[PDB]
Amino acid sequence: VETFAFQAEIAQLMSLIINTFYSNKEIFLRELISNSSDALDKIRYESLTDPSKLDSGKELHINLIPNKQDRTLTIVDTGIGMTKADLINNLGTIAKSGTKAFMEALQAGADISMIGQFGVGFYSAYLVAEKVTVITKHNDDEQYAWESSAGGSFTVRTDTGEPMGRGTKVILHLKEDQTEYLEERRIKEIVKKHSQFIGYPITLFVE
Numbered sequence: 001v002e003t004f005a006f007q008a009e010i011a012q013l014m015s016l017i018i019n020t021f022y023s024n025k026e027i028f029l030r031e032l033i034s035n036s037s038d039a040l041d042k043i044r045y046e047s048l049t050d051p052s053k054l055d056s057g058k059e060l061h062i063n064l065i066p067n068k069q070d071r072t073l074t075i076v077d078t079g080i081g082m083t084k085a086d087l088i089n090n091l092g093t094i095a096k097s098g099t100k101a102f103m104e105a106l107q108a109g110a111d112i113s114m115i116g117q118f119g120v121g122f123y124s125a126y127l128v129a130e131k132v133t134v135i136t137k138h139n140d141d142e143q144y145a146w147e148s149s150a151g152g153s154f155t156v157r158t159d160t161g162e163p164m165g166r167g168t169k170v171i172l173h174l175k176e177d178q179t180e181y182l183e184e185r186r187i188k189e190i191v192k193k194h195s196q197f198i199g200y201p202i203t204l205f206v207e
């Protein structure tokens, strides 16, 4: 288990997301689904010129899996996945500029729902989750588990869990007062409202 500090701008973003009073928390789900859709587009595009990139799984889809016993909502995709370098370094580097922009827009009276326009929508997970675990497998790399409860650090370990072929699972460990996002009718409503035209099957699992 390796522990890393977020870049200061990302930690500041996460604290803003956690601390700002903002009731429209449900938008976290469309930001994660949007990320999954971009990742699926990416592997789909890469496969057109190298069909072997689909040896790790041809099916291109999104699963939403609520688990009341564990209090988690998991967004699974079979998209391109992330490398260790993505997790530790590259995503944060990319996230640096979007963070500043977003934080700037927030006076000029943007609101948190617009976070996705700045390429940092992943962090809106922290509107509803006390802890986020990301399990991910990219073709050129091993399977990894990233985790963070915010507070300025995250961990990365090689994952010994169930091998996943290729793709990413974002496991949201929900805050005590956010269990509505475990309810089928609530998830269905949100997907219909914000993610109704995603170009991949989204299967909402039931409990």
Ligand SMILES: CCCCn1c(Cc2cccc(OC)c2)nc2c(N)ncnc21
Binding pocket: 035, 036, 039, 077, 079, 080, 081, 082, 087, 091, 119, 122, 134, 146, 168
């Ligand atoms: C900024 C988008 C790329 C990183 N990314 C994201 C957001 C993202 C940002 C920062 C960290 C993170 O995982 C720990 C994930 N979701 C992805 C996905 N489902 N598949 C592939 N890559 C993903």
